[PDB]
């Protein structure tokens, strides 16, 4: 469960959120096979609520009604066309599955269903699974409004809803087996792995009997005795009850604490700067790295359903949200996952921002398809950050200096720094304000190099800064912090 199964040298998943299953699969195919991208994570595949105004919210996502494959991003024929596809060329695909939880135990409040099945939430009747009342924890739950009320309390994190959510009694074979059969029914046809959605709320016990009834994966594809790739998604901020390791067992977990403090000290907040990321990683008290599941946006779409550490980025924040992707994929702390948005308006009020009936693109009710502008960047809203010619070559940098060690650290005391990927990459940031100009030591052979964040390699030659590597290694690097990306990145295969 902790491997990712993605092809050899392909190290990176993407998050294509809410994105079509068909829109998937060409993107497999025109963009992510030919890029080097390990796999996507799809957004939940079952059927879900919907509720009546239309109003398409993100969060309807994580409201199931059954486990048929229906859903705004398609159906199952769909589906399966776009597992298909992607792990024709090589790209797999990891879905996000929603099983601590049904609907919202009101929501009657005005909703129908994506796929037409009929549910009840009072009387907890979802037919099209079969669950009943006898499959939910209304009676293990000891609150007395039998939602989690404290979220730091172990027994109420687990036991009770989350957010009114209703929660399904895990410790029964039955429900522990109806959640295999849908994941088993995806693994066959040809997913690799899965987000183990609000694993905080259940308990590790249960989750491992539900994957103990898990199928190796898709022999056509996958070498035999392959296990799905888990990573189960758990807040842990420090000094509550519930610990990540309480989980790794199971499969990776998120380490989100990655994604806050990547983005509290890239922001300088109280003094932080970017030398102190010499330890990056376990030195910093996280999760082990085979264990690990990063990401920097520490919690996208941030509206008011979350409790944890959080960080949003615009324009001079697109700078830093490719600082820190960049930082992030050049590290070699944890396997990787990138996020691909898309373009919601903001409120500015609250403190922060609070627009937060998010939702989509959508087509009336179905998600809007992903357009290519001719520069390669999306349209129809959708951002495609994994398109970004900086984060692109990042994925691709990452690829080049698989299992290299980390080495060559630098830093300036403050917030210019820099380190090597062995003999095959070397990365420099400046996030001071002041430009940063100096001759550092690499652990590359001479040459002449590409940067790959300003421009690209393209037919034996670079379309932004080249870096000269001498023979003993060192190289200079110049980079002002007025640039629009402050950072400079050449490895073994952006070389001439
Ligand atoms: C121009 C893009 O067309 C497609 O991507 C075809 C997707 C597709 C999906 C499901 C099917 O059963 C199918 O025949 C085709
Ligand atoms: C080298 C071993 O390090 C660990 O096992 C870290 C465990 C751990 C558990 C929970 C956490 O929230 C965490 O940051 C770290
Ligand atoms: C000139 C740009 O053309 C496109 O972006 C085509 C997008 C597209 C084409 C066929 C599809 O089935 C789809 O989902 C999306
Ligand atoms: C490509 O251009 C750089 C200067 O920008 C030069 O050093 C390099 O030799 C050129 N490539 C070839 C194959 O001549
Ligand atoms: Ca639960
Ligand atoms: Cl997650």
């Known amino acids: 469960q902790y491997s990712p199964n993605t092809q050899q040298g392909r190290t990176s998943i993407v998050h294509l959120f809410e994105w079509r299953w068909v829109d998937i699969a060409l993107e497999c195919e025109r963009y992510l096979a030919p890029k080097g991208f390990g796999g996507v994570q799809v957004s939940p595949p079952n059927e879900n609520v ?33 597992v298909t596809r992607c792990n024709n060329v090589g790209v797999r695909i990891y879905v996000d599955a929603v099983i601590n939880h049904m609907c919202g135990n009101a929501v009657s409040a005005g909703t129908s269903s994506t796929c037409g099945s009929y549910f009840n939430p009072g009387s907890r009747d979802f037919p099209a699974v079969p669950y009943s009342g006898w499959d939910f924890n209304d009676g293990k739950c000891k609150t007395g409004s039998g939602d989690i009320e404290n979220y730091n309390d172990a027994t109420q994190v687990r036991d009770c809803r989350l957010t009114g959510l209703l929660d399904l009694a895990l410790e029964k074979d039955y429900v522990r087996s109806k959640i295999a059969e849908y994941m088993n029914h995806l693994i066959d046809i040809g997913v690799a792995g899965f987000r183990l959605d609000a694993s905080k709320h259940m308990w590790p016990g249960d989750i491992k009997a539900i994957l103990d009834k898990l199928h190796n994966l898709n022999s056509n594809w996958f070498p035999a005795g392959s296990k799905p790739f888990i990573y189960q998604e758990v807040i842990d901020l420090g000094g509550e009850p519930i610990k990540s390791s309480d989980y790794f067992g199971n499969g990776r977990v998120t380490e989100f604490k990655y994604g806050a403090k990547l983005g509290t000290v890239i922001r300088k907040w109280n003094g932080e700067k970017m030398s102190y990321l010499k330890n990056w990683g376990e030195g910093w008290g996280f999760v082990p790295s085979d264990r690990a599941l990063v990401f920097v946006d520490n919690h996208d779409n941030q509206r008011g359903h979350g409790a944890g550490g959080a960080s949003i980025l615009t324009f001079w924040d697109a700078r830093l949200y490719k600082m820190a992707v960049g930082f992030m994929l050049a590290h ?24 937060d009936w998010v939702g989509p693109p959508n087509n009336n009710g179905v998600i809007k398809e992903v357009t290519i502008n001719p520069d390669t960047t999306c349209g129809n809203d959708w951002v495609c950050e994994h398109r ?20 060559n650290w630098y830093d300036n005391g403050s917030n210019q720094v820099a380190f090597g990927r062995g003999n095959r990459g070397f990365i420099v940031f400046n996030n001071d304000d002041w430009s940063f100009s100096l001759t550092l030591q690499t652990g590359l052979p001479a040459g002449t190099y590409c940067d790959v964040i300003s421009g690209d390699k393209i037919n034996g030659n670079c379309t932004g800064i080249k870096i000269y590597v001498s023979d003993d290694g060192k190289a200079h690097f110049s980079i002002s912090n007025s640039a629009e990306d402050p950072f400079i990145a050449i490895h073994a295969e952006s070389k001439l």
Request: one cysteine or more; glycine letters at 6%; proline letters at 8%.
């Open 50 to 82: 919907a509720i009546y105004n239309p109003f398409r919210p993100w969060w309807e996502r994580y409201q199931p009604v059954s486990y048929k494959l229906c859903t705004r991003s398609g159906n199952e024929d769909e589906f399966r066309n776009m």
């Open 388 to 407: 970004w010619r900086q984060i692109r070559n990042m994925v691709i940098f990452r690829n080049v200096v698989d299992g290299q060690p980390f080495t």
């Open 332 to 355: 070699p702390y944890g396997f990787t996952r990138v996020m691909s948005s898309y373009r919601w308006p903001r409120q500015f009020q609250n403190g922060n921002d609070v627009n």
